């Protein structure tokens, strides 16, 4: 039909508009910035206890407890200071690909190949952790989930949909559609008004939690996007895809800003996180080790190498103190 | 040098570490099979043959050996994004209908699927049980249409046994890893009550091979 020509004209309009505002590049402005040097990080703790591969993790807002989900059907809440397991929750589905720790600390969530996001109640009476709410509604596997409050959680699935739920009622108050491939990640904003979602169609869409519409749409990668993370300002975000390239976009300029790439890396990125001041960009890779980039100048300022299998999950604390990298050899390591 | 209730936190951690170790040594004596095959092949048949939406798990037990079967047919998404969750299954049960050498061929989609999962990055050593379904109807429709309409290089007869052996030998040479893995081919039908015994006799060899891999002899 003739609507495809209208779509092509509007895409060329958007391309000309976002090319008109590219007054400079990030490198030629950040040349007046002293590099951070050789960042050397040592494995402080080494949390061991999982028996199969670790697919997800999330820190706590007190930056001491963390949760980790693995393929042996276990969530484990660790005290990362003393390496004591605080809790160990058995799941009724062994195929978990995501987990999330609530910002209050009362709740934890997990989801995976059974298309259901289970919400567990940590701070309960009668002792043990029990399942508060199973949120079913997606038709593909769950790739990420993130708490907003103790009653709102946004999920992103592999049926090309994100969703905003309500854990008391138990059903989707919003459904975010617009992706053509499987959504693989998610990152809430600091003020939690917006969130980005990267998908398998190499597009990252900036959504809007209050009005369920795709606010902006970014492209630039060549392959499926596996990880996404917000800048601490809340105005930018970095992605990591299967073409060995991380990419720093921008929300106010609707364009990519910097490409974190190196010719010696030929494997995709599994997880991405930022430092607290936004100076470093941490990125977990498939060639068994994590990389540390200077996020303003784009060079490998450090390498975290201590894992024997694929680094799958990665998270920097809320006070910026440590970095937990969990991998497919069932070990998490707290670097500092 | 620890407090009176840091000692008890450490003791709680040791007790739930003991529970993790016990439940992981219990759930490693389970045989985790992965069911695969094309649509309308024989997967939903062989679930019912062996005395019995996301992952569809099916637990059963045959002579002091617990089995888990993971049907993945209802996972309509990208296979390249969750198949490494099954890296480490004991065996892949791949179903192929023999009566698809003329449907719209449709045996060639199954051969491309076998070549896709048999030479995968994650299943470089996972053995494959290979079920060939409805032989008693494949021989009924072999008297009319020839096998040459799906195999143009077939320099053979239209006997049921010769055609079935040609189909099996056309499947078993798709693995490039002839030494690392192996294929256990079977001809089943609706009246058997012995396919589960083939599954048991075929995964006992994978169990022995993995025990021998743990001892150093690959």
């Amino acid at each position: 039909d003739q609507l495809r020509q209208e779509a092509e004209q509007l895409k060329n309009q958007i391309r000309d508009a976002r090319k008109a505002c590219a007054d400079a590049t990030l490198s030629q402005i950040t040349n007046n910035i002293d590099p951070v040097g050789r960042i050397q990080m040592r494995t402080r703790r080494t949390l061991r206890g999982h028996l199969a591969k670790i697919y997800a993790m999330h820190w706590g807002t007190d930056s001491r407890l963390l949760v980790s989900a693995s393929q042996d059907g276990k969530l484990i809440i660790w005290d990362s200071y003393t390496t004591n397991k605080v809790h160990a929750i058995p799941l009724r589905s062994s195929w978990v690909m995501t987990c999330a720790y609530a910002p209050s600390g009362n709740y934890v969530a997990c989801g995976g190949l059974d298309n259901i996001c289970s919400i567990y109640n940590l701070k309960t009476r009668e002792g043990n952790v029990r399942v508060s709410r199973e949120l079913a509604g997606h038709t593909g596997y769950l790739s990420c989930c993130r708490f907003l409050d103790d009653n709102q959680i946004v999920t992103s699935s592999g049926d090309t949909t994100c969703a905003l739920w309500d854990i008391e009622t138990g059903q989707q108050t919003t459904t975010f559609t617009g992706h053509t491939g499987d959504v693989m990640s998610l990152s809430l904003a600091p003020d939690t008004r917006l969130f980005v979602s990267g998908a398998c169609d190499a597009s990252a869409k900036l959504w809007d939690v209050r009005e369920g519409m795709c606010r902006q749409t970014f492209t630039g990668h060549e392959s499926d996007i596996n990880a996404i993370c917000f800048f601490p300002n809340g105005n930018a975000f970095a992605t990591g895809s299967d073409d060995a390239t991380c990419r720093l976009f921008d929300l106010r300029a609707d364009q990519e800003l910097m490409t974190y790439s190196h010719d010696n890396i030929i494997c995709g990125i599994t997880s991405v996180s930022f430092s607290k001041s936004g100076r470093l960009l941490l990125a977990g890779y498939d060639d068994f080790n994590c990389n540390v980039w200077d996020a303003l100048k784009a060079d490998r300022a450090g390498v975290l190498a201590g894992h024997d299998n694929r680094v799958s999950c990665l998270g920097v604390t809320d006070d910026g103190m440590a970095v937990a990298t969990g991998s497919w050899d069932s070990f998490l390591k707290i670097w500092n | 040098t620890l407090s009176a209730e840091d000692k008890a936190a450490v003791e709680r951690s040791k007790m739930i570490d003991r529970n993790l170790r016990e439940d992981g040594e219990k759930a490693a004596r389970e045989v985790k099979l992965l069911l695969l095959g094309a649509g309308e092949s024989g997967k939903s048949t062989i679930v019912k043959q062996m005395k019995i939406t996301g992952i569809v798990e099916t637990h059963f037990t045959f002579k002091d050996l617990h089995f888990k079967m993971f049907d993945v047919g209802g996972q309509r998404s990208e296979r390249k994004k969750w198949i490494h969750c099954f890296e480490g299954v004991t065996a892949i049960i791949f179903c192929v209908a023999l009566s698809d050498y003329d449907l719209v061929n449709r045996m060639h989609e199954s051969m491309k699927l076998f070549d896709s999962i048999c030479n995968n990055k994650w299943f470089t050593d996972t053995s494959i049980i290979l079920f060939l379904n409805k032989k008693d109807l494949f021989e009924e429709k072999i008297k009319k249409s020839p096998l040459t309409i799906c195999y143009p290089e077939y320099a053979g007869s239209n006997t049921y046994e010769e055609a079935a052996a040609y189909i099996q030998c056309q499947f078993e040479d798709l693995n490039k890893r002839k030494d690392t893995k192996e294929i256990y081919t079977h001809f089943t039908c609706a009246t058997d009550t012995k396919n589960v015994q083939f599954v048991f006799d075929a995964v006992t060899d994978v169990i022995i091979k993995n025990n021998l891999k743990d001892c150093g002899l690959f």
Partner: single-chain antibody
Framework: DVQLVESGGGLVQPGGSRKLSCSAS????????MHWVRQAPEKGLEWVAYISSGSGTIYYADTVKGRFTISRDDPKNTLFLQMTSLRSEDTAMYYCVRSIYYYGSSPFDFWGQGTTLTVSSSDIVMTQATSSVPVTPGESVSISCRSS???????????LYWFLQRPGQSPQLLIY???NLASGVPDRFSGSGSGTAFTLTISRLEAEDVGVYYC?????????FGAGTKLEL
């Protein structure tokens, strides 16, 4: 609902043996450490025994060791204390307390009914000055407490626990580890203080605040209770 119902007790000849039990119904009993805590019919509270989760670590008080045995039955959810050769210092009310220990837990949160046992006729000292002060409802009050050793450990905690005992009731956790307020307790209570110097302020003292208030330490065993402050009208 959580219930800890004790049984056994009554009149016992001196020198005889008895055994109290504590049926636990309503919570995951196998994960909780259990305590037996004594209370004399005119004095205050004193700690008797503590068995751990999974019976790994057992502690007794120094004035009760050797002739008492604390044990538990986890499939049956019961907690036994078998006492042998009862003296005249062992006529008291025995309470069954639960306490779970991990990062952020609230120990000593639930207390049992407590059973009466009537016979026939380098520890840390925790002072409290016994300041049984009268107070009108509506105003503020502040109860003090003092130790002989610094309760502030190296990790950052300050193991001081505050308990309220109403007239004719079991005790109840208000403040655990100096600062943190327990659950189900209104936010008017506040714990504060530095090493060996603690205080508990109540703002707008309402009804059901009259009663005895105890300060316990959990820095190292044996656990020593304060003498008690009996607020009244």
């Amino acid at each position: 609902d959580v219930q800890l119902v004790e049984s056994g007790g009554g009149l016992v000849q001196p020198g005889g043996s008895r055994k109290l039990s504590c049926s636990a119904s309503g919570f995951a009993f196998s994960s909780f450490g259990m305590h037996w805590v004594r209370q004399a019919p005119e004095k205050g509270l004193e700690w008797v025994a503590y068995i751990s989760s999974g019976s790994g670590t057992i502690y007794y008080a120094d004035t009760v060791k050797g002739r008492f045995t604390i044990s538990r039955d986890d499939p049956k959810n019961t907690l036994f204390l078998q006492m042998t050769s009862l003296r005249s210092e062992d006529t008291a009310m025995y309470y069954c307390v639960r306490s779970i220990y991990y990062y952020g837990s609230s120990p000593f949160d639930f207390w049992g009914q407590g059973t009466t046992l009537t016979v026939s006729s380098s520890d840390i000292v925790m002072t409290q000055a016994t300041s049984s002060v009268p107070v009108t409802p509506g105003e503020s009050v502040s109860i003090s407490c003092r130790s002989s050793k610094s309760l502030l450990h190296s990790n950052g905690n300050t193991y001081l626990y505050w308990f309220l005992q109403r007239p004719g009731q079991s005790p109840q956790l208000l403040i655990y580890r100096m600062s943190n307020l327990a659950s189900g307790v209104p936010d008017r209570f506040s714990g504060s203080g530095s090493g060996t110097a603690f205080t508990l302020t109540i703002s707008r003292l309402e009804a059901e605040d009259v009663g005895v208030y105890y300060c316990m330490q959990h820095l190292e065993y044996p656990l020593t209770f304060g003498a008690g402050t009996k607020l009244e009208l």
